[PDB]
Amino acid sequence: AAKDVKFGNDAGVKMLRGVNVLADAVKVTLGPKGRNVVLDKSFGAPTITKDGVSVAREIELEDKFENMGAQMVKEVASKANDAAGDGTTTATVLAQAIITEGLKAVAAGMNPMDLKRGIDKAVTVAVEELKALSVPCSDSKAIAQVGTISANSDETVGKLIAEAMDKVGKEGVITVEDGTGLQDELDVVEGMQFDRGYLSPYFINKPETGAVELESPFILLADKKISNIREMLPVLEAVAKAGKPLLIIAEDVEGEALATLVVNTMRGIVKVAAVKAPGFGDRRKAMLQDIATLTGGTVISEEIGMELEKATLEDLGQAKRVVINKDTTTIIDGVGEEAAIQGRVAQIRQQIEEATSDYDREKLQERVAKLAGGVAVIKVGAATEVEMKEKKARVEDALHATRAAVEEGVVAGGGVALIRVASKLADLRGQNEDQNVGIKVALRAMEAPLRQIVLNCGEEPSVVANTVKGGDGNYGYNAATEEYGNMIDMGILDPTKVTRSALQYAASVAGLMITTECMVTDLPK
Amino acid sequence: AAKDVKFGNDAGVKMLRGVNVLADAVKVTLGPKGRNVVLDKSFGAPTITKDGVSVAREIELEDKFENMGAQMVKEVASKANDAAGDGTTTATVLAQAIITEGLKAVAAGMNPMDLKRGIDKAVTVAVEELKALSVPCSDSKAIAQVGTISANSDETVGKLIAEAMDKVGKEGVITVEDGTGLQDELDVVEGMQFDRGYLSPYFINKPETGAVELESPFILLADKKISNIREMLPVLEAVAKAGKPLLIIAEDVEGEALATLVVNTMRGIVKVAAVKAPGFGDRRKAMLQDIATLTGGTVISEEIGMELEKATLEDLGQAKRVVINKDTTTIIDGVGEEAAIQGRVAQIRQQIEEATSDYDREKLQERVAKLAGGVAVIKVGAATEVEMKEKKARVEDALHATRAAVEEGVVAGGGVALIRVASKLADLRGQNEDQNVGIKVALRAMEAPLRQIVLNCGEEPSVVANTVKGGDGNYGYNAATEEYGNMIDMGILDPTKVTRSALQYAASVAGLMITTECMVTDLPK
Amino acid sequence: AAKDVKFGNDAGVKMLRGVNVLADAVKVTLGPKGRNVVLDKSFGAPTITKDGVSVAREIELEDKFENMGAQMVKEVASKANDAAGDGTTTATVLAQAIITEGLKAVAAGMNPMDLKRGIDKAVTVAVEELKALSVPCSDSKAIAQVGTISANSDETVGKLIAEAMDKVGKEGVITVEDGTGLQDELDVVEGMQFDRGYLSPYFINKPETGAVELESPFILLADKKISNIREMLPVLEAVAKAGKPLLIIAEDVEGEALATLVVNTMRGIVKVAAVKAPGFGDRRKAMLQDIATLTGGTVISEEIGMELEKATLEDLGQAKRVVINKDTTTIIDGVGEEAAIQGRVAQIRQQIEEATSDYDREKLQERVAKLAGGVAVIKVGAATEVEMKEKKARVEDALHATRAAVEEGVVAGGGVALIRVASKLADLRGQNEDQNVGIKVALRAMEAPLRQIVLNCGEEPSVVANTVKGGDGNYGYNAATEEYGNMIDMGILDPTKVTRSALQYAASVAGLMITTECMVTDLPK
Numbered sequence A, B, C: 001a002a003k004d005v006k007f008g009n010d011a012g013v014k015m016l017r018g019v020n021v022l023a024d025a026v027k028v029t030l031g032p033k034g035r036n037v038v039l040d041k042s043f044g045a046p047t048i049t050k051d052g053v054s055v056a057r058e059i060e061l062e063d064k065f066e067n068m069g070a071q072m073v074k075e076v077a078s079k080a081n082d083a084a085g086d087g088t089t090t091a092t093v094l095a096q097a098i099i100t101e102g103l104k105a106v107a108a109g110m111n112p113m114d115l116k117r118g119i120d121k122a123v124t125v126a127v128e129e130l131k132a133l134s135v136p137c138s139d140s141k142a143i144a145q146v147g148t149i150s151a152n153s154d155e156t157v158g159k160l161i162a163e164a165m166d167k168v169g170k171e172g173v174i175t176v177e178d179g180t181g182l183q184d185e186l187d188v189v190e191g192m193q194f195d196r197g198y199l200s201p202y203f204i205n206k207p208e209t210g211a212v213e214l215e216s217p218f219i220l221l222a223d224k225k226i227s228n229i230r231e232m233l234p235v236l237e238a239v240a241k242a243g244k245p246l247l248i249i250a251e252d253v254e255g256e257a258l259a260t261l262v263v264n265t266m267r268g269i270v271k272v273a274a275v276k277a278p279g280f281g282d283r284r285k286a287m288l289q290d291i292a293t294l295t296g297g298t299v300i301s302e303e304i305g306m307e308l309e310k311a312t313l314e315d316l317g318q319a320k321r322v323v324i325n326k327d328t329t330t331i332i333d334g335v336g337e338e339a340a341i342q343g344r345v346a347q348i349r350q351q352i353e354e355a356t357s358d359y360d361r362e363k364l365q366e367r368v369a370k371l372a373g374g375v376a377v378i379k380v381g382a383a384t385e386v387e388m389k390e391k392k393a394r395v396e397d398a399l400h401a402t403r404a405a406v407e408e409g410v411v412a413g414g415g416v417a418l419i420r421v422a423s424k425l426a427d428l429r430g431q432n433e434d435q436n437v438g439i440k441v442a443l444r445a446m447e448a449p450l451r452q453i454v455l456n457c458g459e460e461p462s463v464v465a466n467t468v469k470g471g472d473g474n475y476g477y478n479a480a481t482e483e484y485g486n487m488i489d490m491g492i493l494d495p496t497k498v499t500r501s502a503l504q505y506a507a508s509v510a511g512l513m514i515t516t517e518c519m520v521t522d523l524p525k
C-alpha cells in the first residue's frame, strides 16, 4: 500500500510526541505514591491500575508516526520485563528522559552518532559503577531479609524462601504450588528446569503468570522435527483416552503440526503444549535422554528407526507437574525410578573423569547438577482458598525478587542508586563535544526516576533531588513516609539486576531513536 | 451601548487570564537578570526594555473582560510608582501571586470576604514587621552609603547626595541639572515645591520623566477659577512677545480654558502649563501670595477688583526653571528679591508666635520651611555631553532611592525581606478557616519576588527559596553573582518604603478582584 | 490599541524568520561577486542594486512579529554604517549567524544570559586580537597605497589623498569640491570642523552624500536656545535680501523654531540649516567665539543683553562653503581676517601656559589645532562634467576609507581577518558550559562573511573556508580572480575599524535578541 515517508526533524517531532504520550501515561504509576490510571474495557467497569505494564499494553496512537514512537519505546518495558521481571516503569522514565534531551540536541545541530556514543559510554561506565555499589545477598539471613521485604514485611515468606534456597542452593530450581491445608510445606522432588519456553503464547492456560501449567501430564520425547500431524495422531488419541495432558519435547514443532496443536488445545479437545529440546547438536540427544531417564520415558529418535506412529502410552514419560514460561520449562516430580536416575548420574559423573576439555567438562557438570539437584516445591498454606491464592502470589513475587537479589545483589531504592552513580561520573568525557553532550544527557536522565517518584508524592522533585545529591552513600528520600534517611536501613532496596536492565534497555532504544533519520508507514487510508 | 455582563466564575476566569498576560509580560524583567521585552512602535525600530512600567503601559487585551483584569492590576504598578517611584514590577508579581491563589480558593467554595480579610490581616502585620526589620538611614554616612550603592558603587554620587541633604535637610528640595563643565557644583537657590501636578497629561514635554519642564517662564498667579479663554488672551499675547513660556497657578483651570491651553501648547503656538493653587479655603490665598513673593509676581484676585485682562508682564512672576509631575510642582530659582522673601518669612514667623491653635501653627511652620528652605541644585560635571547625561541619570536615580531610604529605612533586597517577614508570621491566625487561608495566600505570595528573580537567572526557584528560608536575617541569594551571602554586606538593599508600597498596593487590588462578583463591559461591537 | 503578546519560543521563531528575510535579502550583495537585488518603485523602472544598505531600507514585513525581528537587526547595519560608513552587509551577515545559532542554543535549553555572556567575551577578546593583527597605515607611502586601492587602482587619487594629509596632518580636515578645469588642485584655507550634525534630515540638499551643502552662506552665532521664530524674523529677512543661505549655530534650535526652518527651507523660501554649538557648559561659549573669529561674525549672547532682533548682516559671519553630515559640520574658508584669527591663536596658546590641569590643557590644545590647522580642499579636475562628478565620487570614497585606515589600520579582506582571529581563540572558555557554547557561537559566526563571499561567487563555502583555515597570516581567497594567495599583496584590505564595528554591532543586537523573552505589538487590525 502507498506509504507516507518522513525525514529528519518532521519524523523526530512525531516520535517524541508518541513517546511522551506513552511515558506520561505510564510514569504516573511509579513508586509508593503512584497514581491510578483508568483503562477502558468494552464491557463492564473499566480497569483501575497502578501497574506500568498494564497501562503500556493499552497505548496505541492514531497518528501513525506518533504511534511508531510509542511502540518503539514500549519495547523498552517489555525487554526490561522479560530480562528482570520488574522495573518496566523506571525503564520508560529513563527512556523518555534520554530521548527528550537526545532529540533536542539533534535539533540543535549535534551529531546523532556522537550523541549515541556518549550515551553508551556513560551507560557502560554507570553499569560498572552500579556493580561496585551493589551489596551482596549471599547468606540465608540476607536472603530472608530480602524475601521478607519483598513480601510486604511477611517474615514467614522470607523464612520459606531462605529454607528453599538452603535445600537446593541459591541457584537451584524453586516452585510454588497451592497448599493442601493450613501450614506451609517444603519438599524436594526429582525434577529439572531447562532453557526452553512454549512454542506459542496460546498454550498459556494461566495468563496471570503468562505461563503454561500441566498436571500429571505425559511427556513425549521426540528426537526430531515434527512437521506432520499424521505422526502424532496415534499418540494423541492414546493420551486423550487416559484423560491426561501431553507435553511435547521435540527438536522443534513447526508450522503445520504446531498450528494444529494450537487449534486443538484451543477447543478443549486435547491439552497439549510443545517446547524445543534443550541445547543443540550432539549434547541435545544426551540431554533429551536425561529427561527421558527422569520422567521414565523413551526417546523416539529416527536414528534407531523408530516412528511416532508406533509409540504407545508406555513410551511417554510422566511427572506430577510441568510449568513453562516464555523461555523456561520446569519438570516437577518425574516418575523415573531412583535406580535409573542415580545410575544415569553415575554415568555422567564418569564422563567428567574422562573429559579431555574444560568445555566438555562444564557441559557435563551442568547435566549432573540438573539431574542430581531436583526441584524445591513450596506449598503455600492458608485458612481459606482466597487467602491462599493471595499468599501464593506474594510468595511468587518475593521469590522472584530474592532470586534477582542473589544474582547481582541490591542497591538503594527510590532511584538513589542511579543518582549516586551519576554524580560519580561528573568528570566522564568522550572524544568530542557532541559525545560530551551525550554523556550529560544520560547522567541527567539518571535522576528522572527519583524525580518522578517525588512528583507522584506531590512534593518538589528539584528540592528532593538537590537534597539527596547533597548527601552520600545510601542517603535518600523515603517517599512512603516523606522523610530522608538511609535507604538500606529503611528497607528500600532494588535488585541491581533490575536497575541495570532498566538503564540498559532505556539507553539502547533511545540510541536507536536518536539515530533514526527516516520513518515509513501506511497512508492513513 | 448594549453591555455584556458576567458573573462569578465566568468573570473570575476572564480576570485571571488578563492578569496573567500582564504579569507574565512584566515579571520577566525583574531584578539583575531580567530579560528584555520588545515593544512594537508604529515607526522605526522597536523598543527593547527591562523596565516594568514601560511594558505595563503597552498592555491592552482584545477580550474586554480579560482587558479589565489587566487594567485593574496595572493600577497596582502605577500607584506603587506614584507613591514610591520604584517597585512596580515587584508589586505586579505580588498581585499576581495573591490573585491567582485567592481566586483558586474562591473557586474551591471559600468565602471571598473572609479570604480578603485574612489577606488584609497578614499585610497589616507584615508591614509592622517590616518596620521592625528596617534599618534607619538618618546620618550623612548612611545617606552616602545608600546613594553610593544606588549609583552602581559610585562614591562620588553618594558624597553629592549627602552634601545636598546636609544643605537643605534630608526632607528638603533637591534638583539635578546639567553641569557647566568638568566638576560637580552644589548651590542653594530660592525656590519651593508644592503638592499640585499638571492639569492635563498633555502639558508633558518630557515623556521620559512623565514631566513638564519650563525654562525662564513667567508665572501667572490668579486667585480664582479660569473658565473663559477671553480673560487670558491679553496676558497670553504679552507672554508670546517676550518669547518665554507661561505657568498658570490658578484656583483651577476648567473645561473651556484648559481645553484651549491644551490645543494651543500642542501646536507650538504658546508654551503654557497650568496647575491648581496649593491648599484650600483661607490658607490658599496666603500660600498663593508666598509664591508671588518668591517669584516677584502679583496675585490677581477678584476680591480687590482686579481683572486678568488688565494684567501685564510686570504682574507675572518669574523663575529660572519649573518642573511639574503628576502631583508635584517645583519652582526653581525665583526672581523675587531677598528683601521681600526674607521679610515675608519674618511675617509668617510672627504669625507662629500669635497662633492660638496647633493646627494653625503647623500650617504656618510648613509655609516658612518652604519659603526659607530654598532648593538645592546639584549640577553634574563630566568630560563629555554623553558622560554627563549618563552621570546625571545616575544621580537622579540614586537621589530618588536615597530619599525613599531616608523616609522609612532599608531592608535586605533580592526579595529576602518579605521572605523573612513571611516566616515570622507562620503562626498568624484569623477568625475562621477561610481567613486562615487568606493569610496563607498572602504569606506564600511574599515569596514570589525572590522566586521570580531566581527564575529570571535560569536557576531553580524552589531550591533557592528553600535555602534562603533555611538561613536568617540578612542571608539571601545574590542573583548577579549567583552566590548566597549577606545581602547588606553585598550591597543589595531596598528602601522599606518601596517594599511596603508594593505589598500594600498588590494586596489592595487583589482583595478587590477576589471580592468581585460581576463585570460589566460594552459588547465587542 | 489592543495588543498581541508573544513569549519565549513563539516569539523566538518570529524573530528569527524576520531576521532571515532581511539578512537573506542583503547578504546576496556581499563582495566582488555580489548579486543584484531588484527594488520596486511606484513609478518607472525598478532599482537594481548591489548595495546592502539600499536593500535593507526597503525591508518591512507583514507579520508584525517577523517585522520586529527585521527592524531590530536592521539597527545593526545602520549603527555600523554611522560608526564606520562601510561594512553594513558584513555586519548583517555576522548578526544572522550569531542570532541563528544563539536562538537554537536557547531552544535547546541553554541559559540565554550565559549565551550572551560567552558571545560578549569572545567579541571582547576578538577585538583585542584584531588590533594585534592590524597593519598600520602611518607614512605617506601606505596612505597613497590605501588611497589607490580604494580608488579602483587610480594612483592619481592615492597621491592626492597623501598630499592632502601631508599638508594638514593625517588627523586634519580634508574636503573635496568640483574642479574648475582639467587638473587637480590642492589648497589650504582657513576653516574648521566640529562634531555637530544637522538638527533635521530635511536640511539635506544633497541626498547622494546624505549631506547639507551651502555656498557663501551667512553664519548666525547665537549663544542661547532658539524656541521662537519671532527672534529670527529680522535676521532671516535681512539674509533673504542679500540672496545668500544661512547657517544657524545656536546652543540648540527646538520644536517651534526648527519646525518653521524645516517648512521654510522646504518651500525654497530661504535656504537655512541649523546645528548645535560644539561642546557644553563653559567651553561652549569659548568655542562659539572661535567660530566667530574664524568667520568674522559676532556672538549674540543674552549675558551681554543682546537680542536676535537687533542683529544685522554685519553681525553674521561668512565662509565660502559649509558642509554638514549626520554628525559633523565643517566650515570651509572663513572670511575672518588673519590678524584676528592668528591673534586668537596666540591668546589660547597662552591659556595653555597658564593651564593648571591636563584636562584644561588638552581642551585648549584641541581649540588651537582646529583654529590654526585650517582645511585642505581637494578640487577634482576632469575633461567633462560627467567624468568630474565621477572622479569626485571616487576621491570621496577613497578619502573615507583612507581615513579609516589611518585611525586603526588595515587587516586582510575577504573575511580572512575574522577567520584568523577565530582560530586564535579556540581555547577561550567562560564560567560554564552555556558560556562556552556562547563563545563557540561567536567564533562560528566569524567565518560567515568569508563563506557568504564565496557562496556569492558560486564556489563551495566549506571547501574554501577549510583551505583558508589551513594556511595562516594573510593567506586567503581572492574572490575576483578565484585564486588563493596573500590578501595584502593582492590588495584586498579592510580598514580594521570597519571589521571591528561590524562585529561589535552584530554581537550587540544579537545579544539583545537572544535575551528577549517577550514581544508586544498591535493586533493586525
Ligand SMILES: Nc1ncnc2c1ncn2[C@@H]1O[C@H](COP(=O)(O)OP(=O)(O)OP(O)(O)=S)[C@@H](O)[C@H]1O
Residues within 6 Å of the ligand: A029, A030, A031, A032, A034, A051, A052, A053, A085, A086, A087, A088, A089, A090, A091, A412, A413, A414, A415, A453, A477, A478, A479, A480, A481, A492, A493, A494
Ligand atoms: N518507600 C519508598 N520510597 C522511595 N521509593 C520507593 C519506596 N518503596 C518502593 N520504592 C521505589 O519504587 C520504585 C518501584 O516502583 P514501581 O511502581 O514498582 O515501578 P517499577 O518497578 O519501576 O515498574 P513496574 O512495577 O514494572 S510497573 C523502585 O525504584 C523502588 O525503589
Ligand SMILES: Nc1ncnc2c1ncn2[C@@H]1O[C@H](COP(=O)(O)OP(=O)(O)OP(O)(O)=S)[C@@H](O)[C@H]1O
Residues within 6 Å of the ligand: B029, B030, B031, B032, B034, B050, B051, B052, B053, B085, B086, B087, B088, B089, B090, B091, B412, B413, B414, B415, B449, B453, B477, B478, B479, B480, B481, B492, B493, B494
Ligand atoms: N544582586 C541582586 N540579587 C538579588 N536581587 C537583586 C540584586 N540587585 C537588585 N536586586 C533586586 O531586584 C529587585 C529590583 O528589580 P527591578 O528590576 O528594578 O524591578 P522593580 O523595582 O520591582 O520594578 P521596576 O524597576 O519599577 S520596574 C529588588 O528586589 C532588588 O533588591
Ligand SMILES: Nc1ncnc2c1ncn2[C@@H]1O[C@H](COP(=O)(O)OP(=O)(O)OP(O)(O)=S)[C@@H](O)[C@H]1O
Residues within 6 Å of the ligand: C029, C030, C031, C032, C034, C051, C052, C053, C085, C086, C087, C088, C089, C090, C091, C412, C413, C414, C415, C449, C453, C477, C478, C479, C480, C481, C492, C493, C494
Ligand atoms: N577580491 C576580493 N576577494 C575577496 N573579498 C573581497 C575582494 N574585494 C573586496 N572584498 C571584500 O568584500 C567585503 C566587502 O564587500 P561589500 O560588498 O562592500 O560589503 P560591506 O562593505 O560588508 O557592506 P556595504 O558596502 O556597506 S553594503 C570586504 O570583506 C572586502 O575585503
Ligand SMILES: [K+]
Residues within 6 Å of the ligand: A029, A030, A031, A034, A050, A051, A052, A089
Ligand atoms: K506502580
Ligand SMILES: [K+]
Residues within 6 Å of the ligand: B029, B030, B031, B034, B050, B051, B052, B089
Ligand atoms: K527591571
Ligand SMILES: [K+]
Residues within 6 Å of the ligand: C029, C030, C031, C034, C050, C051, C052, C089
Ligand atoms: K555589495
Ligand SMILES: [Mg+2]
Residues within 6 Å of the ligand: A086, A087
Ligand atoms: Mg515494580
Ligand SMILES: [Mg+2]
Residues within 6 Å of the ligand: B086, B087
Ligand atoms: Mg527598580
Ligand SMILES: [Mg+2]
Residues within 6 Å of the ligand: C086, C087
Ligand atoms: Mg562596502
